[PDB]
């Protein structure tokens, strides 16, 4: 099968297309239809293309340390730290310190070239701070995710262990394939299981 076909295979395995009963007005361009009970089904080719664009953005950042991945969620930590471990970016887990991107006198001061987030509605504080330091943002956006101050919103299911793990594993794989780390003639040795949350 094609690479797109394989990735959407994994997305269907991980329920990355399962939306919420509510869909945001700026995310309706990725929701394909609405289930009878109320769930919106995310168009997953759009998800794949957004992931490809995000990867194109990441590999253009020739210093991966200038990238920060954050997850206030509990199911995103493993995924975020493993994504940073494989990609080479920085990973902060749990609470953002209000001031991290603005307070230059804070010890946690950072000036990331790229801010990758997991859920724009649980991670609103770092997005608000990135709106104060010219920081572009990539986010994994659900159907109800607010799109304010989000530059590359990947339409995907956030609430869920498997979805977060699969999305971050795919994004890391794409970044490394574009970087040449994963040689095109070879697959990636890391499974998606290591990106899942451990209870």
């Amino acid at each position: 099968l094609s690479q797109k076909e394989q990735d959407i295979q994994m997305m269907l395995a991980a329920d990355v297309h399962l939306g919420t009963k509510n869909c945001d007005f700026q995310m309706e361009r990725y929701a394909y239809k609405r289930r009878s009970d109320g769930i919106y089904i995310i168009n997953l080719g759009k998800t794949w293309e957004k992931l490809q664009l995000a990867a194109r953005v990441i590999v253009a950042i020739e210093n991966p340390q200038d990238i920060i991945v954050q997850s206030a969620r509990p199911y995103g930590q493993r995924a975020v730290l493993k994504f940073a471990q494989h990609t080479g970016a920085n990973a902060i887990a749990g609470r953002h310190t209000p001031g991290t991107f603005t307070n230059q006198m804070q010890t946690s001061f950072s000036e990331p070239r790229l801010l990758i987030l997991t859920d724009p509605r649980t991670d609103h504080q770092p997005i608000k701070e990135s709106a104060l330091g010219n920081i572009p943002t990539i986010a994994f956006c659900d159907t109800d995710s607010p799109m304010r101050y989000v530059d590359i919103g990947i339409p995907a299911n956030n609430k869920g262990r498997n979805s977060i793990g699969c999305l971050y594993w795919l994004l890391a794989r794409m970044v490394l394939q574009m970087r040449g780390t994963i040689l095109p003639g070879h697959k990636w040795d890391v499974m998606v299981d290591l990106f899942f949350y451990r209870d």
Binding site: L12, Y32, I41
Partner: peptide, 27 residues
């Protein structure tokens, strides 16, 4: 393998021309 999906999601897959080797109706 054995990806049980409903009618709406299979619609999307079709709209994306997706054979979905393991795509099966949930009934």
């Amino acid at each position: 393998d054995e990806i049980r999906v409903d009618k709406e999601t299979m619609d999307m897959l079709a709209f994306l021309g997706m054979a979905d080797l393991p795509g099966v109706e949930r009934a």
